[PDB]
Amino acid sequence: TAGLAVELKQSTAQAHEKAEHSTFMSDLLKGRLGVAEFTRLQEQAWLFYTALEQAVDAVRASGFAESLLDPALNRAEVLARDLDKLNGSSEWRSRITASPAVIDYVNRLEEIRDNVDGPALVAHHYVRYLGDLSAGQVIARMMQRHYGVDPEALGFYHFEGIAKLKVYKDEYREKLNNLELSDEQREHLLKEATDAFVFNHQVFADLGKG
């Protein structure tokens, strides 16, 4: 009754805290790593965003939650543009390989794609895109300040088509509240949001491990 958006934020709050406190992300954001480690992160993100956006496309094409699944949110192509700049070459696409965590995350996203699992997809959409909308300005500024990354290579963190980010985030949360879901679908979505945070935490863990 608080609304699905508020339940999601409460349910995932601890997982969000654990992700912020992960050693790799904490070290990266504090300036203790470098542009190389930042670029390795963006490469792994390109892999899972590519899979996520295949799943989004399939669910949108099935007619589920179409207005929530705004294609302007797509991050895979802008990540590739950033990586072409960061690596000074397009050849990173033929050099990178998924970490074990990314393999697992991509496997889940491909099952969601194949099953056209709308509620599961919405959970992953919330976990990635609402986080991106919330954190992009602060993370981009940290990469620029600590590592000298030019804003031209921080496009992943920017949504130039969204004139008022807060208005958009509030509208996005209201679209979540407005979804019509059965009790099973709602519980499935909430459980998948927890799983989505775990997948993302493990991407950071793998990056920290090397």
Choose which of 4, 8, 47, 140 interacts with ligand COH (CB under 6 A): 8
146 in Cβ contact with 75 (< 8 Å) = no
Q: How far is CA 186 from CA 5, 65, 163, 191, in A?
A: 11, 13, 31, 9
Choose which of 83, 98, 106, 127 interacts with ligand COH (CB under 6 A): 127
Choose which of 76, 116, 135, 198 interacts with ligand COH (CB under 6 A): 135
100 in Cβ contact with 174 (< 8 Å) = no
**Active-site position among 60, 108, 113, 128:** 128
**Active-site position among 40, 49, 102, 172:** 49
- Residue 156 found at the interface with ligand COH (CB under 6 A): no
Shortest distance in whole angstroms from residue 53 CB to Cl ion: 6
Show the site string, 102-121: x = touches ligand COH by CB under 6 A, - = not.
Answer: --------------------
Picking from 141, 139, 111, 99, the residue whose alpha carbon sits closest to that of residue 51 is 111
Choose which of 76, 181, 198, 205 interacts with Cl ion (CB under 5 A): 76
**Active-site position among 27, 57, 131, 186:** 131
Residue 180, token pair as written in the block: 């019509």
Shortest distance in whole angstroms from residue 116 CB to ligand COH: 22
At position 173, the amino acid (one-letter code) is: R
- Residue 190 found at the interface with Cl ion (CB under 5 A): no
Which partner, Cl ion, ligand COH, none, binds residue 11 by CB below 5 to 8 Å per kind?
none
Scan for tokens 């302007």, then name that residue. Answer: 72
Q: In angstroms, how far is CA 183 from the centroid of its own chain?
A: 26
At position 61, the amino acid (one-letter code) is: A
Neighbours of 104 (CB within 10 A): 17
**Active-site position among 75, 132, 172, 206:** 132
